[PDB]
Amino acid sequence: TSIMAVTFKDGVILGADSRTTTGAYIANRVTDKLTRVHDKIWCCRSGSAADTQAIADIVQYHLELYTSQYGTPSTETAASVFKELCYENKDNLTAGIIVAGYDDKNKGEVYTIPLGGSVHKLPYAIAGSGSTFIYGYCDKNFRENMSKEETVDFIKHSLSQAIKWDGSSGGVIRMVVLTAAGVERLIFYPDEYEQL
Amino acid sequence: TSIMAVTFKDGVILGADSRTTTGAYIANRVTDKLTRVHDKIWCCRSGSAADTQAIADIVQYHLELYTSQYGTPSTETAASVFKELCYENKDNLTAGIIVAGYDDKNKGEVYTIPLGGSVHKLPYAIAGSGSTFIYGYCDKNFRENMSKEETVDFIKHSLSQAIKWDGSSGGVIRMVVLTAAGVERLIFYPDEYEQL
Amino acid sequence: QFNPYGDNGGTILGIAGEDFAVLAGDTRNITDYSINSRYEPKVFDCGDNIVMSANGFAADGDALVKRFKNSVKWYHFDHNDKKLSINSAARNIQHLLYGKRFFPYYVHTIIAGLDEDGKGAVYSFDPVGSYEREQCRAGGAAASLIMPFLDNQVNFKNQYEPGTNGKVKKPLKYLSVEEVIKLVRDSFTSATERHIQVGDGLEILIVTKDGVRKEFYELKRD
Amino acid sequence: TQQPIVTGTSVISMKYDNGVIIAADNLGSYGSLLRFNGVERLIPVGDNTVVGISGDISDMQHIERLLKDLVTENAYDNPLADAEEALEPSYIFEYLATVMYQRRSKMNPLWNAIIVAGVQSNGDQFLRYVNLLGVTYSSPTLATGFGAHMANPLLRKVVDRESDIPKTTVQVAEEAIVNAMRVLYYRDARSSRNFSLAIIDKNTGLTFKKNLQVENMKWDFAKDIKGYGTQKI
Amino acid sequence: SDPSSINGGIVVAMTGKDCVAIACDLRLGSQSLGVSNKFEKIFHYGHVFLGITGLATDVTTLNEMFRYKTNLYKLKEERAIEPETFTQLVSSSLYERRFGPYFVGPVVAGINSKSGKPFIAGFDLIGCIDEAKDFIVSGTASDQLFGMCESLYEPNLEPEDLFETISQALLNAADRDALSGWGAVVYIIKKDEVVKRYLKMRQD
Amino acid sequence: MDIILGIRVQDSVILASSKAVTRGISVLKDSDDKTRQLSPHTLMSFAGEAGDTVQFAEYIQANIQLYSIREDYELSPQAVSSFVRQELAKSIRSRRPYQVNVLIGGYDKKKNKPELYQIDYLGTKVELPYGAHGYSGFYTFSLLDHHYRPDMTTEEGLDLLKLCVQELEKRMPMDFKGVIVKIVDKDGIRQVDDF
Amino acid sequence: MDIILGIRVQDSVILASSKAVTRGISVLKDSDDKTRQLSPHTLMSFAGEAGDTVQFAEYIQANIQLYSIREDYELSPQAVSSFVRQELAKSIRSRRPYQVNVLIGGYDKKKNKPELYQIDYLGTKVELPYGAHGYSGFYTFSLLDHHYRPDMTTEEGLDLLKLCVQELEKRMPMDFKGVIVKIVDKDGIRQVDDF
Amino acid sequence: TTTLAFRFQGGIIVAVDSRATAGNWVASQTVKKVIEINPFLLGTMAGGAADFQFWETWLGSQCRLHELREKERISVAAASKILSNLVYQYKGAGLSMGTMICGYTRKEGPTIYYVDSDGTRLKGDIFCVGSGQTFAYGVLDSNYKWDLSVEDALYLGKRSILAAAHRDAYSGGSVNLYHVTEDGWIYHGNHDVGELFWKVKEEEGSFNNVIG
Amino acid sequence: TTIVGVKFNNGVVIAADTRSTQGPIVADKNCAKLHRISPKIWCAGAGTAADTEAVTQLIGSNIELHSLYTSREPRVVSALQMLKQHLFKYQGHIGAYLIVAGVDPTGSHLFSIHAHGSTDVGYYLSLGSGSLAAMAVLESHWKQDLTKEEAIKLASDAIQAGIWNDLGSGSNVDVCVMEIGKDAEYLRNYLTPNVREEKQKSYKFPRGTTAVLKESIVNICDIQEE
Ligand SMILES: *C(=O)[C@]1([C@@H](O)C(C)C)NC(=O)[C@H](C)[C@@H]1O
Ligand SMILES: *C(=O)[C@]1([C@@H](O)C(C)C)NC(=O)[C@H](C)[C@@H]1O
Ligand SMILES: *C(=O)[C@]1([C@@H](O)C(C)C)NC(=O)[C@H](C)[C@@H]1O
Ligand SMILES: *C(=O)[C@]1([C@@H](O)C(C)C)NC(=O)[C@H](C)[C@@H]1O
Ligand SMILES: [Cl-]
Ligand SMILES: [Cl-]
Ligand SMILES: [Mg+2]
Ligand SMILES: [Mg+2]
Ligand SMILES: [Mg+2]
Ligand SMILES: [Mg+2]
Ligand SMILES: [Mg+2]
């Protein structure tokens, strides 16, 4: 699994591969690991597919009910609800989730929630089996306040390398852009990103 | 352990960190993992310190006896002797060795020998626990026929990142340059490479 | 940990007639839920009017058959081209199998032919060498499906004569080669239906005084 | 007893009217790490045989050296080394099969699955399998690892039995092999896009093709797939 | 250790022309030790017959349970339960013990009183229904029974012919199983008469 | 505990049960009565894990005695055996199952017939002419198969029982210190004090 | 095998050994003599794992008989016991050790004294007035501690031995089918045929 | 498996069943559990079938070599000890054997030695080995006398196997009878348990529990 | 078990083989693996056969009550959500692996569900021991904008690949077509390429072959009047 979220000038972009493997068999080569818990709060999923889907579905329910009562929730609030589920059920869960969202007040924010259930607010986050191979690259190449086009290139190049080396990652590179302008989905095929 | 060997225009350069750990305790923070089996054939050692030292000592003996009878051995020959020991004793060895050498005929050559005992001739090689974090970086940044200064920078930046992320790697970055001109040792301290 | 044994499936069947003998076996070769080959010969002519099959782990099965064929060759050299009788072949195979008593050939071996009086003969072996002359023997995966059917239709077990009601058994009349082949084919057709490792093809080797003849029949390939 | 470290995945093959085709990708995996991208796993022996190997690469390199050594040894005191007494596919296979079974019997196996493809002196197609257990079998189509599960079904649609071999041309056979390699790239997590293919024909001889790539891939439909059930955006 | 093969025993059922047949051995054992030669495994609730193999305490328990349930069914419905309906009841009842199951291999047999159609069905321990046209097998010699039935069976057999087929299927299967035998019973079932026959077999 | 036997003859049921109680390396007692009277014409012998045996036997005894008072009526041996089976069948899927095997010998006053029921700890009931639990049957069943007749007298039944005990005393490794024998018939339950 | 006892009195050594041979569930034999005569005035009883016991005993017997012929002389009980101990001490660090415990009863003709040696499978030798192996000592040592005197007669020794066997027959769970008793004195070795 | 052998006035009776089982599966009903070592010696099969066949056929070879070298029939004691010493060398390796080496010589008379894969070697008058041994012992112990006739002794051995064949699930098929005299063994036929059971039930009045 | 699902122009099709097995033995040669959740929502199951039957009946029952409560035809996403949440709760212990397909007022849908509760979306899917053989065919011949006739052909061909090459699958091919604005057509035994050949011999016994001890009439009727 190769997943990442990166903050930039206009907001935040989530990125992910599309491979789902049962051992060495690719069960699904066109998986969507970028999932929506609110209009402009999305998450990247890694670990158990069942666990991360179940968690994400519960979070979406909580934020839908939150919105009905108290209006639009913050990205921090969404991350807290993810944490609460991941921390309190740490013994029975295998979930590594990156939460990313866009407020107008706070702009682009990224929170990573690893296995333990801890929360870490970061400028950008990487996770999944394929992330190990791009710690060096991402650290050397990340800058704060990048443009949309630069951030797309940064994610595309990063996940391209993660896919290249990690057998558990592959397929298409899906991306979701979160800004004031709205929500934009992007897709990049093997023939495009492999030759980078 | 972060180790690598890189071929370039004038020959080949071996690079390594200096950390030796027993669990989480650093037993030796100034270790020399770049070791000499012949005048211009060196190796980088990863895995069991006892095993890799014992192997390297035996290889040095074999190449010393080879030289007495048949003159200077090729880098390929040295790699073959390493392989023979690593392959035939695979059940009792934990050794990941990169062999690097300089002929005048063949110029700079790099052979990597992972756990199994297989041999792989490459333009450059990376190995050790810390190598996982720089597959992405090294693949994106390596070029063939680099200069001495470029290759030193490539190794310095690579191992800097490997050290940054890998707890098992650290200390000084040792390097050994192999060219027609001779054998040059280089050292780079934390204050230098950390700020890169 | 390394596991030196495997299961290649398959099923074999030997039936001894009055003046003939048949040794049949399906031609399917498998591992787990995959088919390796739809036609991989399992029953072999070993010379001296003897046919042999070693069902189970195919590597050990091929090794054993190879060593026995070799034993036949050296029996000719050492003993003035003397014909190896079926009873002598059976004893020889025991020593080949028991030779690896503590690391066995993981196979159920069956040989067939004619005894020194010209009558039909079938011998059956366990993996470690215990052997015995028998009139009827199925071996391998679907052996449990076939043997009861053969007890009933070859040896007329539990069959009595109408009118007497359990008092007089059905007489053990001799079966012709045409009659035996029918029972072999129906045994394998039935086994194919209910056992997943049985199918593809059936190969029968018939042994008479005239020599060794072969017959092949299609089986369901699912 | 050992465990395989650097590994190679599926080898696939089939017979056609005048010869045999065999193929295998150029990847040497290190667990889930796709470590080595330039590994040749098809090793020709003479001009009439190609040995395709999967499994442990260090053991493959050992087998490669044995075959190289076999050619040398056959040439010794042999005026007909390049003619009547040249190495046949059947000779090369039986040698390997002997070694594989001996090594498993000493509880120290060569951790491989091997397919020997070639053409005999009389023009007959040779295609037979052997693995770490010393198990051997022949079939119109043969494949190792994931290939057994995904390639064979596709190749068996072309040559379902022995009588289909004369009806199958080299163009149809090669097409089926190349398509199978694409399917394995879609679905095998330890595979690569780059592969090698070898054709051994009784008329045109040995044709060894390097640096092939999987092409004509379908990915466009991925853009329409969203979420994992209820999600619309 | 394995609950389904402590006590041993077998059941087989077949269809014929306007008739069904169900049969079972009579052995109850404690592994190698033969304990009883009168342990019948076929029961009936009205015109619906149920054979049960496996762990003997559960065989007894389930019989008592289905007697219980079919009796209440009859009082409320004001009619006897049918084979198709009973099959669903057996399936429901077994599956409610999904994670603590009865170690049994049930077999339903009977003729629908309204349509006159012959019916047989089998189940695994956990409730999955196997509704075959030809025959159903169950018990420690199920492999043997599958082999016998598959070769001996032909469709549309008359009651007196069907008796011979199912009897020979059971007897020869039981003789190749250590934990089956010690006598046998065969039920021949027609729309409005049922004949029960005890078979003579080897007592080892 | 170790050996318990049962035999149903013409007009009575005879139960034989060992006297030894062994705890590890020592035989703590050699006069233990492994039986309880459930009702005037129903006797139950038992063998299994220590503690569970007596606890189970007394629990059953109390329940049958309660039924007898409530209805002013004695349950049939068949009825008692079915009750006992259900308790064991209930027990086997409990947190901690009763590890007890029993024989129930009774005389049915309605049918004027002796009845012997064998029930193991799983709740496996069988009505038999003669029965046993554990390794006891392994020695005695061949003798019982040979000599047993359904029309035997009580004296003949005791003689066949002596032959069973003698075979046990010859071929069993364990010293079970003899047996206490009890007879159940139309007149009730009595103990054979010399055996 | 099970129970082996030994007692050294004034002028003789008495060895008692059980007769039972049990293999699993059955007592295959009830008249087994668990002893071998090593020399005219030296007797060795044995108990341990099946096969190993007899193989070891006969191996020792052959070696002592060989020594007797070579030197035309009988080794002292002390000398024989030391030889036996060394063989067991050698055995315990072997590929497959002899699992055999022994008692060596002998009469030293030079010193005119009876001698009893107890040696376990590890090669642990002790000279004793009375001894046992396995669980036998657990019952009999309290009686031997109480009654034993060094100046006892052979008849008194046999009476004390009967009291030991009676206690074993009362409190041991296993039926060892009685004992064969043998006496070793100046005149040699003889068997007490009634015990 | 049920095998027995007992000494009596007229020599030795050996009786065995014929069943072979692999788990619950009945592999064979026609197994020969008596090895004819030579015209004067017999051996029984219990535990491992191959181990018995292989090593007792081998024993017959050793007994033949003995009488070629010594110009004299081998004793039952010596023959049994050759086998027991052999299996003792293999102790631990996993041989499975329980056999009665039966014979009748001048110096010994009728002799039976129980030989074991644990290395046990016991001389005795009555022996029963197998999963159904306890059932056979019951009939033997209650009916055995030294002064049995050859006819009654043969029946007792037959009846004792039948007793085990009935109760023991892993015993049955058929009964093989042998009678060992000083001039050699004499085969007394194969007797199907199916037919024998009903014959015995009727003529003897036994097995009243079973309906026939 | 080979089960597949294929999307097409105006709907979705699912297919399955008809072999059920207990170990290496074939229990039923004509097993029905296509299950009805609601009239126009069907699914095919693999894994523990009881679990797949049970879980589809339970959800199907609740779906029916939900449809009556809301006065609306049931949706596939409802069946999907209810199935996954049920399976997740039991942490994989309910061994049901399902391909869920159907048409509803929202449109045509195709999903897969695994035992642990994870779900996937796709245009073509396969599950079971023969899924790799089937997926090989799907990956070789699938395209966008398939017609009804093409999708049935592709689906049944994918099942055939499983039937022939996978030992866990066999016998016949069952199909169910769910098109938008139409009744779902359940094609039981769509293909029958595995009929057993006539046997060489008839094994009908002569009457009176079996030995009998006792005969008796069984009383199946109730207690009688008078
Ligand atoms: C990624 O984490 C991953 C994906 O299959 C799911 C779809 C998130 N999880 C795994 O367990 C496998 C190995 C992949 O890495
Ligand atoms: C590197 O491989 C390493 C070094 O300690 C030695 C000196 C090569 N080996 C290890 O086991 C530890 C963990 C280091 O990675
Ligand atoms: C008997 O000992 C037995 C027979 O199968 C062989 C043929 C002697 N051996 C066994 O292992 C099983 C349990 C049989 O009782
Ligand atoms: C298929 O999944 C399968 C079928 O038997 C049932 C009927 C669905 N399930 C299994 O457990 C077996 C092995 C078959 O693959
Ligand atoms: Cl997912
Ligand atoms: Cl070091
Ligand atoms: Mg990849
Ligand atoms: Mg099949
Ligand atoms: Mg039986
Ligand atoms: Mg029996
Ligand atoms: Mg019981």
Classified as helix, coil or strand, D130 is strand
- The single-letter code of the amino acid at F69 is I
Return the exposure string of E161-196: e unless at least 16 CB atoms fall within 10 Å of the residue's CB, then b: bbbbbbbbbbbbbbbbbbbbbbbbbbbbbeeeebbb
D173: phi > 0 → left, psi -120 to 50 → alpha, else beta; which?
A: alpha
Please give the Cα distance from H201 to F146 (Å, whole number).
Answer: 9
Tell if the CB–CB gap between D226 and A167 is shorter than 8 Å: no
The residues that bridge with F118 in the sheet, in sequence order, are: F103, F126
Between the CA of residue G42 and those of A154, G86, I215, what are the distances in Å? Answer: 95, 17, 76
Chains A and C touch, contact meaning at least 3 pairs of CB atoms under 8 angstroms apart: no
User: What is the rounded CA–CA span in Å between residue I122 and residue D186?
Assistant: 15
3-state DSSP percent of chain G in helix, strand and coil, to 5: 35, 35, 35
Q: Ramachandran region of residue F59, left (φ > 0), alpha (ψ -120 to 50) or beta? A: alpha
Backbone angles phi, psi at I192, to 5 degrees: -135, 75
Active-site option among B1, B31, B75, B151: B1
Residue type for position D22:
I
Cα dihedral F130, F135, F138, F143 in deg (nearest 10): -50
Helices marked H in chain A — which ranges?
49-70, 75-88, 135-141, 148-165, 190-193
Give residues with Cβ within 8 angstroms of F43, minimum separation 6. Answer: F13, F15, F35, F36, F37, F104, F105, F106, F182, F184, F189
CA distance B68 to B60: 12
Show residues of chain B in contact with D28, CB under 8 Å: 118, 120
CB-defined site of ligand 4, < 6 Å: I 1, 20-21, 31, 33, 45-47, 49, 128-129, 168
Q: Which residues contact G98 (CB under 8 A, 6 or more apart)?
A: G48, G52, G55, G56, G87, G88, G91, G121
DSSP B73-110: PPHHHHHHHHHHHHHHTTTT--EEEEEEEE-SSS-EEE
- Owner of token pair 């050294």: G8
Q: Is the CB of B1 under 6 A from ligand 2?
A: yes
B31 Cβ below 6 A of ligand 2: yes
Quote the tokens at residue A156: 């595309």
Nearest to C121 by CA among C215, C179, C52: C52
Dihedral, F168, F174, F175, F177 alpha carbons, nearest 10: -70
From the candidate CATH numbers 3.40.50.720, 3.40.30.10, 3.60.20.10, 3.40.50.1820, the one assigned to the domain spanning E1-204: 3.60.20.10
A77 carries an active-site annotation: no
At position G135, the amino acid (one-letter code) is: Y
What distance in Å separates the CA atoms of residue D146 and residue D131, rounded to the nearest whole number? 15
Q: Chains near E, with 3+ CB pairs < 8 A?
A: C, F, H, I
Burial class (CB in 10 A: 0-12, 13-18, 19+), C145: buried
**Residue I90 identity:** Y
Measure in Å the smallest separation between the Cα of H175 and chain G Cα atoms.
22
Which one of D187, D219, D226 has the shortest CB-CB distance to A172? D219
Cα–Cα distance measured from residue B24 to residue B170, given in angstroms and rounded to the nearest whole number? 12
Separation between Cα atoms, residue H122 and residue A30, nearest integer Å: 75
- CB contacts of C196 in chain I (<8 Å) are 21, 24-26, 167-168, 170
Please indicate whether, in this complex, the C-beta atoms of I48 and E197 are within 8 angstroms of each other.
no
Find residue B16's DSSP bridge partners: B3, B174
Distance CA B149, CA B157 (A): 12
- Among H2, H174, H173, H7, smallest CA distance to H103 is for H7
Nearest Cα neighbor of E25 from E5, E8, E50, E48 is E8
C-alpha to C-alpha distance for B160 and B137, rounded to whole angstroms: 11
* Residue of B137, B141, B195 to mutate, testing the A interface (most A Cβ within 10 Å of its Cβ): B137
Q: Is the CB of B170 under 6 A from ligand 2?
A: no
Q: For residue H139, report the distance from its CA to the centre of ligand 5, in Å.
A: 71
- CA-to-CA dists, residue B68 to B37, B64, B71, angstroms: 14, 6, 6
Cβ contact (<8 Å) for E204 and H21? Answer: no
Breaks in chain F follow which residues, C to N over 2.5 Å? none
H189 three-class SS: strand
What residues does each domain of chain B span?
1-196
Pairing, β C211-218 against β C201-208: antiparallel
Sign of the Cα pseudo-torsion (E42, E48, E54, E56, in order): negative
Query: Which among I11, I15, I41, I20 has a CA at the least distance from the CA of I126?
Result: I15
Q: Are E97 and E56 in contact (CB under 8 A)?
A: no
Residue nearest (by alpha carbon) to ligand 2 atom 3: B1
Q: Which ligand is nearest to the CA of F103?
A: 11
**Is the pair C, D in contact (3+ CB pairs within 8 Å)?**
yes
Token pair 């053969």: residue: C150
Query: How far, in Å, are D150, I40, I137, I153 from residue I14 at the CA level?
Result: 21, 12, 15, 11
Domain count within chain H:
1
Q: Which domain holds residue D2?
A: 1-233
Tokens matching residue C24: 């049949």
- Separation between Cα atoms, residue H16 and residue H130, nearest integer Å: 10
Count of all residues that appear for chain F in the document: 195
Q: C204 vs C53, C150, D35, CA distance in Å?
A: 11, 17, 50
How was it solved?
X-ray
Q: Which domain holds residue C218?
A: 1-222
A chain contacts of residue I118, beta-carbon cutoff 8 Å: 48-50, 53
Cβ separation of I207 and C162 shorter than 8 Å?
Answer: yes
| Pairwise CA distance, residues C85 & C68, whole Å | 13
Q: Do B116 and D36 make contact, defined as CB atoms within 8 angstroms?
A: no
Q: Which residues of I touch D (CB under 8 A)?
A: 77, 80-81, 84, 111, 118-123, 132-133, 135-137, 139-140, 142-144, 161, 164-165
What is the torsion angle, in degrees rounded to the nearest 10, for the CA atoms of residue A176, residue A177, residue A178 and residue A181? -130
C158 CB-near residues (< 8 Å, 6+ apart): C152, E167, E168, E171, E172, E175, E201, I210, I211
Whether residue F89 lies within 8 A of chain E, CB to CB, comes out as yes
The Cα G192–Cα G17 span in angstroms is 12
Q: How many CB atoms lie within 10 A of CB F87?
A: 17
Rounded Cα–Cα distance for residues A83 and A91 (Å): 14
Give the closest residue to G23 by CA, choosing from H21, H79, H127, F48: H127
Query: CB–CB of H172 and E198 under 8 A?
Result: no
The number of residues in chain E equals 204
User: If you measure CA to CA, which chain I residue comes closest to C36?
Assistant: I165
As a whole number of angstroms, the distance between CA I9 and CA I150 comes to: 10
Domain containing residue D186: CATH number: 3.60.20.10
d(CA C84, CA C73): 10
Q: Is any Cβ of chain H less than 8 angstroms from the Cβ of G32?
A: yes
Contact (CB, 8 A) for A174 and A192: no
Whichever domain contains H193, its CATH number is 3.60.20.10
The finding on whether B20 has its CB within 6 A of some atom of ligand 2 is: yes
At what resolution in Å was this solved?
2.8
Q: For ligand 3, is residue H44 a contact (CB within 6 Å)?
A: no
Alpha-helical segments (H) within C45-104: 58-78, 86-98
Q: Subunits touching H (CB < 8 Å, at least 3 pairs)? A: C, E, F, G, I
Give the Å distance between the CA of D94 and the centre of ligand 10: 49
* Chains C and H touching, counted as 3 or more CB pairs less than 8 Å apart: yes
Phi, psi dihedral angles at B64 (to 5 degrees)? -65, -40
Of E143, E151, E201, the CB nearest to C158: E201
The Cα I178–Cα I9 span in angstroms is 11
Q: Could you tell me the end-to-end alpha-carbon distance of chain G, in angstroms, rounded to an integer?
A: 20
Give, in degrees to the nearest 5, the angle at Cα H43 between H37 and H44: 140
**Fold classified for A1-196:** Glutamine Phosphoribosylpyrophosphate, subunit 1, domain 1 (3.60.20)
- For residues B37 and B12, is the Cβ–Cβ distance under 8 A? no
Domains, chain G, ordered by start: 1-195 (3.60.20.10)
Ligand 5 midpoint to CA A53 (Å) = 7
Instruction: Enumerate the residues of chain H whose CB falls inside 8 A of the CB of residue F130.
Output: 209
CA distance G142 to I51: 67
Taken as a whole, chain I contains a residue count of: 226
H120 vs G25, G51, G96: nearest CB: G51
The three-class DSSP label of residue F180 is strand
Estimate to the nearest angstrom the gap between the alpha carbon of D212 and the chain centroid.
15
H206 touches chain E (CB under 8 A): no
Q: H134 C-alpha to center of ligand 4: Å? A: 45
I214 contacts in H (CB within 8 Å)? Answer: 211
Residue boundaries of the structural domains of chain I: 1-226
Contact C153 I203 (CB under 8 A): yes
Count of structural domains, chain C: 1
Give the integer Cα–Cα distance in Å for B121 and B45. 17
CB A130 within 8 A of CB A165: yes
Are C59 and D134 a contacting pair at CB < 8 A?
yes
The answer, yes or no, to whether any atom of ligand 1 lies below 6 A from the CB of A97, is no
- What's the A50 CA to ligand 1 centre distance in angstroms? 10
How many CB pairs below 8 A link E and H? 62
Name the token pair of I157: 């061909």
Q: Ligand 7 centre and the CA of C75: distance in Å?
A: 59
- The domain locations on chain E are 1-204
Give the residue whose CA is nearest to atom 12 of ligand 4: I21
Nearest to C170 by CA among E172, A167, D142: E172
Look up residue C114 and give its two tokens. Answer: 């004619």
CA D184/CA B55 separation, integer angstroms = 40
**Spatial separation of the C-alpha atoms in residues B66 and B73, rounded to whole Å:** 7
Q: Mark E12-48 as b/e (b = at least 16 C-beta within 10 Å).
A: bbbbbeebbbbbbbbbbbbbbbbbbbebbbbbbbbbb
Q: How many residues does chain B have?
A: 196
Q: Which of F20, F22, F138 minimises the CB distance to G25?
A: F138
* Measured CA distances, I16 to B20, H44, I35, I126, I155 (Å): 58, 56, 11, 10, 9
Amino acid at A24: A
Smallest Cα–Cα separation from E52: which of E109, E99, E1? E109
Topology (CATH level 3) of domain I1-226 = Glutamine Phosphoribosylpyrophosphate, subunit 1, domain 1 (3.60.20)
Measured distance CA(H59)–CA(H56) in Å, rounded:
5
The C-alpha atoms of residue I116 and residue I91 are separated, in whole angstroms, by 5
User: Distance from D22 to chain B by nearest Cα, in Å?
Assistant: 24
Measured between alpha carbons, how far is C169 from C159 in angstroms, rounded to an integer?
6
The dihedrals phi and psi of C21, each to the nearest 5 degrees, come to -155, 140
β-strands F26-29, C11-16 pairing:
unpaired
Asked whether A18 lines ligand 1 (CB < 6 A), one says no
What is the DSSP track for I187-210? EEEEE---PPPPPSS--PPPTT-S
Known binding residues of H are: 49
